[PDB]
């Protein structure tokens, strides 16, 4: 994971790692954060060309710390089931429940 910009939000490489890291941890323990359903399967309905193969899991990323439950916000980190970083996606600039890539994800 590297620095990225989702809509207007700038996430540092450390912030992306921490989120990616958390998603992995929970995926591994067959856990979810708080009372949410994250991390959960990310189907890739949008056809992003991730640098790693799937299956994938999505997890929120946000400023101010690692997601713990509640509103996930617009941003997400995507990892595969091998805990390999796939990319960052966002609802910002998208329509409906669609996602668009954050900088570096296409
Ligand atoms: N748009 C979209 N939704 C997905 C995908 N994979 C799973 N979903 C989920 O299917 C619904 C459509 O947006 C939501 O519940 C969404 O999860 P999240 O809202 O947790 O991101 C995907 O690749 N794209």
CA of 49 from ligand 1 middle (Å) equals 17
For the chain, the domain total comes to: 1
Residue 22: give the domain boundaries: 2-106
How was this model experimentally determined?
A: X-ray
Do 34 and 65 contact (CB within 8 A), yes or no? no
Paired with 79 in beta bridges are 57, 85
CA of 45 from ligand 1 middle (Å) equals 8
Q: Please state the atom number of ligand 1 nearest to the C-alpha of residue 40.
A: 20
For the Cβ of 36 lying below 6 angstroms from any atom of ligand 1, the answer is: no
Nearest CA to ligand 1 atom 12: 97
Residue 48: how many CA atoms within 13 Å on its side-chain side?
27
| CATH code assigned at 106 | 3.10.450.30
Contacts 24+ apart (CB under 8 A), 36-43: 36/67, 36/69, 36/70, 36/72, 38/67, 38/72, 39/79, 42/76, 42/78
Resolution in units of Å: 2.0
């Amino acid at each position: 994971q590297s620095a990225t910009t989702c809509g207007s939000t700038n996430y540092s490489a450390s912030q992306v790692r921490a989120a990616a890291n958390a998603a992995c941890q929970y995926y591994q323990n067959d856990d979810t954060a708080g009372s949410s359903t994250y991390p959960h399967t990310y189907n890739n309905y949008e056809g992003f060309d991730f640098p790693v193969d799937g299956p994938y899991q999505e997890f929120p990323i946000k400023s101010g710390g690692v997601y713990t439950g509640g509103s996930p916000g617009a941003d997400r980190v995507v990892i595969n089931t091998n805990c390999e970083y796939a990319g960052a996606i966002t609802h910002t600039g998208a329509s409906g429940n669609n996602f668009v890539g954050c900088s570096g994800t296409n």
